[PDB]
């Protein structure tokens, strides 16, 4: 029951998500090893993701979290990257697929820097890069990120686990140290925008 709405480049909604993507790029510690070398994107397509059931799932969980966090959901708009964006927009996030050996355990990972999430698009550590060229810094192949509504609630701070600690609803990690956000229940995030893009070759 997912509908995708293709947003026009003239749309203020398109532009707002576009700006968030470009402006949150950072120069990574790994020198581009995981996600490639770039300081900007070619943004190709922004699609609003509309799924009533996934939204109801999300708001139902948000109510419970808010009750346990002084009536505040601690909601954030965050990026997600993984090879499984197609599955998520249709079925929602699903912690049953989370990697037990994750830095912060078997959760679903989000970032406030688009470039951080970009590092996970082809897998952990950029995996083996694009399928066609096996190139983690591929400028040719089109990538996709999600820009998601995420309920953090009472977030447990951690440095570099299967559920949040008691009384908490997420983990905020700081492993240059950028923030990463981890949820252990898939219904705490709604995949709001599907972004199709390329990393741009610098010059
Ligand atoms: N088929 C199928 C399928 C596969 C995965 C699904 C999924 C469906 N629905 C999901 O929500 N997922 C999430 C996306 C994936 C994920 N989210 N965050 C991470 C990550 C990020 C950074 N460090 C450590 N783990 N992963 C993940 C989990 C396992 C391998 C690779 C990745 Cl990117 C689990
Ligand atoms: Zn490629």
From Swiss-Prot:
Residues binding Zn(2+): 130, 133, 138, 141
Q: How is it modified after translation?
A: Ubiquitinated at 'Lys-48' and 'Lys-63' by RNF146 when auto-poly-ADP-ribosylated; this leads to degradation. Deubiquitinated by USP25; leading to stabilization. ADP-ribosylated (-auto). Poly-ADP-ribosylated protein is recognized by RNF146, followed by ubiquitination.
User: What is known about the tissue distribution of this protein?
Assistant: Highly expressed in placenta, skeletal muscle, liver, brain, kidney, heart, thymus, spinal cord, lung, peripheral blood leukocytes, pancreas, lymph nodes, spleen, prostate, testis, ovary, small intestine, colon, mammary gland, breast and breast carcinoma, and in common-type meningioma. Highly expressed in fetal liver, heart and brain.
Q: Which domain of life is it from?
A: Eukaryota
Q: Which residue ranges does the record assign to the PARP catalytic domain? A: 8-203
Give the subcellular location: Cytoplasm; Golgi apparatus membrane; Nucleus; Chromosome, Telomere
Write out the function statement from the record: Poly-ADP-ribosyltransferase involved in various processes such as Wnt signaling pathway, telomere length and vesicle trafficking. Acts as an activator of the Wnt signaling pathway by mediating poly-ADP-ribosylation of AXIN1 and AXIN2, 2 key components of the beta-catenin destruction complex: poly-ADP-ribosylated target proteins are recognized by RNF146, which mediates their ubiquitination and subsequent degradation. Also mediates poly-ADP-ribosylation of BLZF1 and CASC3, followed by recruitment of RNF146 and subsequent ubiquitination.
Subunit (UniProt)? Oligomerizes and associates with TNKS. Interacts with the cytoplasmic domain of LNPEP/Otase in SLC2A4/GLUT4-vesicles. Binds to the N-terminus of Grb14 and TRF1 with its ankyrin repeat region. Interacts with HIF1AN. Interacts with RNF146; this interaction leads to ubiquitination and proteasomal degradation. Interacts with NUMA1.
Instruction: Report the family membership.
Output: Belongs to the ARTD/PARP family.
Q: What is this protein called?
A: Poly [ADP-ribose] polymerase tankyrase-2
Q: Which organism is it from?
A: Homo sapiens (Human)
Note the residue range shown relative to the complete protein. 952 to 1161 of 1166
């Amino acid at each position: 029951g997912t509908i995708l709405i293709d947003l026009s480049p003239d749309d203020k909604e398109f532009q707002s998500v576009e700006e968030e993507m470009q402006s949150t790029v950072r120069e990574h510690r790994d020198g581009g090893h995981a996600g490639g070398i770039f300081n900007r994107y070619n943004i190709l397509k922004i699609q609003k993701v509309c799924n009533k059931k996934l939204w109801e799932r999300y708001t139902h969980r948000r109510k419970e979290v808010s009750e346990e966090n002084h009536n505040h959901a601690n909601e954030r708009m965050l990026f997600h990257g993984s090879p499984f964006v197609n599955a998520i927009i249709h079925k929602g996030f699903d912690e049953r697929h989370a990697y037990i050996g994750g830095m912060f355990g078997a959760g679903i990972y989000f970032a406030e820097n688009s470039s951080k999430s970009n590092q996970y698009v082809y897998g952990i550590g950029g995996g083996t890069g694009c399928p066609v060229h096996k190139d983690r810094s591929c400028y040719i192949c089109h990538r996709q990120l999600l820009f998601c509504r995420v309920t953090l609630g009472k977030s447990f701070l951690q440095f570099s686990m299967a559920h949040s600690p008691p009384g908490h609803h997420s983990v905020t990690g700081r492993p240059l140290a950028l923030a990463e956000y981890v949820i252990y229940r898939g219904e705490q995030a709604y995949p709001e925008y599907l972004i199709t893009y390329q990393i741009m070759r610098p010059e």
